[PDB]
Amino acid sequence: QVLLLPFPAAQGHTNPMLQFGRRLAYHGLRPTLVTTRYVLSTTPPPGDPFRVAAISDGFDDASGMAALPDPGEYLRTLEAHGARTLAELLLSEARAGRPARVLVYDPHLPWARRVARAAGVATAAFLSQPCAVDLIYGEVCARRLALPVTPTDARGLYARGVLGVELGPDDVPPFVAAPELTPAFCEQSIEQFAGLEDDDDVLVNSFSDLEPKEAAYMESTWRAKTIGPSLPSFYLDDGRLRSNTAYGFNLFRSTVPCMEWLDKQPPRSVVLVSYGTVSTFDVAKLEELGNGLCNSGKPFLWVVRSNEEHKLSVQLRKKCEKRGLIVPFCPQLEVLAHKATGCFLSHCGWNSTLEAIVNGVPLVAMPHWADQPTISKYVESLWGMGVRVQLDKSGILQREEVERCIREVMDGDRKEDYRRNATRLMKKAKESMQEGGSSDKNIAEFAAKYS
Numbered sequence: 177q178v179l180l181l182p183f184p185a186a187q188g189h190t191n192p193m194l195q196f197g198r199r200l201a202y203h204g205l206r207p208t209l210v211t212t213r214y215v216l217s218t219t220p221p222p223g224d225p226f227r228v229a230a231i232s233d234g235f236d237d238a239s240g241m242a243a244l245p246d247p248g249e250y251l252r253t254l255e256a257h258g259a260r261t262l263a264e265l266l267l268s269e270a271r272a273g274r275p276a277r278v279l280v281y282d283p284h285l286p287w288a289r290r291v292a293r294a295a296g297v298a299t300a301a302f303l304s305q306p307c308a309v310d311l312i313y314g315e316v317c318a319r320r321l322a323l324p325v326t327p328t329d330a331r332g333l334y335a336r337g338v339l340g341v342e343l344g345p346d347d348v349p350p351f352v353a354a355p356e357l358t359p360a361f362c363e364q365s366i367e368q369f370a371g372l373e374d375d376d377d378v379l380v381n382s383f384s385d386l387e388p389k390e391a392a393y394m395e396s397t398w399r400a401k402t403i404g405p406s407l408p409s410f411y412l413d414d415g416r417l418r419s420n421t422a423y424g425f426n427l428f429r430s431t432v433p434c435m436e437w438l439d440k441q442p443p444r445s446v447v448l449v450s451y452g453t454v455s456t457f458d459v460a461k462l463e464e465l466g467n468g469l470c471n472s473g474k475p476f477l478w479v480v481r482s483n484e485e486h487k488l489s490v491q492l493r494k495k496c497e498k499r500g501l502i503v504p505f506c507p508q509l510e511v512l513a514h515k516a517t518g519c520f521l522s523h524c525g526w527n528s529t530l531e532a533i534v535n536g537v538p539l540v541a542m543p544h545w546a547d548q549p550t551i552s553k554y555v556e557s558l559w560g561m562g563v564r565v566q567l568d569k570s571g572i573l574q575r576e577e578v579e580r581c582i583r584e585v586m587d588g589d590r591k592e593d594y595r596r597n598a599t600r601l602m603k604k605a606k607e608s609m610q611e612g613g614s615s616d617k618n619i620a621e622f623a624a625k626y627s
């Protein structure tokens with residue numbers, strides 16, 4: 177009855193959409209996760225309260241995206257077989273007494289919108305990036321803003337009280353500030369907003385107290401309602417869903433344990449390190465990162481993915497045994513909530529950021545692309561909960577800067593500010609998702625409307 181369509185295999189898009197579905201279920205709606213037959217065949221299903229329903233990207237027996245390395249050429253294949261299979265599913269379900277009351281869809285998949293509207297199924301866009309990045313892409317689609325987006329473009333927005341911070345050249349979203357480096361990602365980011373005004377609902381995974389100017393603008397401009405942070409209820413100290421304590425659809429397996437190692441560590445001492453589930457680091461970059469961690473002297477929990485750890489030398493991996501632990505995946509929210517954890521050296525993907533916020537953990541920001549540079553700027557200025565690594569003239573992260581930023585957040589004069597500010601945002605985040613808060617209300621309205 178409620179269909180959920182995250183960009184398949186995108187952990188950063190699947191996690192919040194599923195958490196949003198859990199809230200819907202709490203309000204009596206029945207959610208269904210819609211993903212590829214491949215992903216469904218390699219990942220155990222979320223479980224109650226979710227049904228599962230499979231579409232196809234063409235490659236039902238093999239990771240479509242390793243087989244089809246070019247970004248542009250994956251999307252076309254997904255769009256082709258997806259749109260076909262999606263429309264099949266709608267009719268099947270309707271002709272089974274289970275029509276779709278609404279399709280909640282990742283707007284990185286604009287063809288979902290088309291297939292649905294053709295069946296007269298209501299649509300709700302699910303934006304899983306911060307308002308501040310969303311509205312910038314938005315202003316480009318609306319041709320209110322001209323490619324390339326510049327710090328001056330951004331300063332106008334700030335002057336008009338739409339952006340709460342002034343974006344510099346390294347803070348504007350790369351995908352539209354330098355579209356040349358990533359032409360496919362550029363149009364995908366802008367396409368999101370084409371046909372959005374024609375959606376029954378627009379939903380953004382954020383909360384208003386976090387981005388008050390940007391969320392005000394997104395609501396008035398695109399009808400976007402904040403429904404986040406869309407994380408398990410437990411971490412929001414929300415007891416309505418007692419058993420909602422972990423994301424239920426991990427696309428990566430946790431081989432090596434870390435929780436018992438974390439127990440042994442002293443309070444507020446561990447650096448969590450992760451650049452997420454999408455980005456890749458080359459050999460030299462892993463070396464600077466790892467040595468920066470060792471030189472910092474702090475204990476650290478370093479997430480180096482299975483499909484990355486081959487780029488990790490034996491020599492460096494042994495050097496990290498003294499004070500660190502290296503794992504392919506960790507229960508990141510559980511880690512962030514742990515007493516031992518002192519800060520989070522993170523690429524600042526939006527879920528990682530919201531997960532740090534909801535646990536009051538200060539950040540060392542090492543962004544690469546997409547929304548991460550903008551998020552990093554917010555972490556550093558307006559939110560004041562951490563610092564961003566400075567890259568040198570060649571764009572290289574050096575081990576000295578890694579150690580410097582860690583010591584700065586953990587031991588510097590401002591260490592209590594970063595913590596205070598993080599705790600400050602933590603309380604507003606929890607408030608917005610608890611019964612009666614601003615995101616909680618938006619979620620209840622949405623559910624009321626389709627029940």
Ligand SMILES: O=c1ccn([C@@H]2O[C@H](COP(=O)(O)OP(=O)(O)O)[C@@H](O)[C@H]2O)c(=O)[nH]1
Pocket residue numbers: 187188189191450451452453454455479504505506507508509524525526527528529531
């Ligand atoms: O070891 C890990 C690393 C990743 N995550 C989860 O994966 C998501 C990553 O999303 P994000 O937007 O932060 O980065 P992305 O991987 O999409 O670039 C977050 O919810 C993390 O909690 C996790 O559970 N364990």
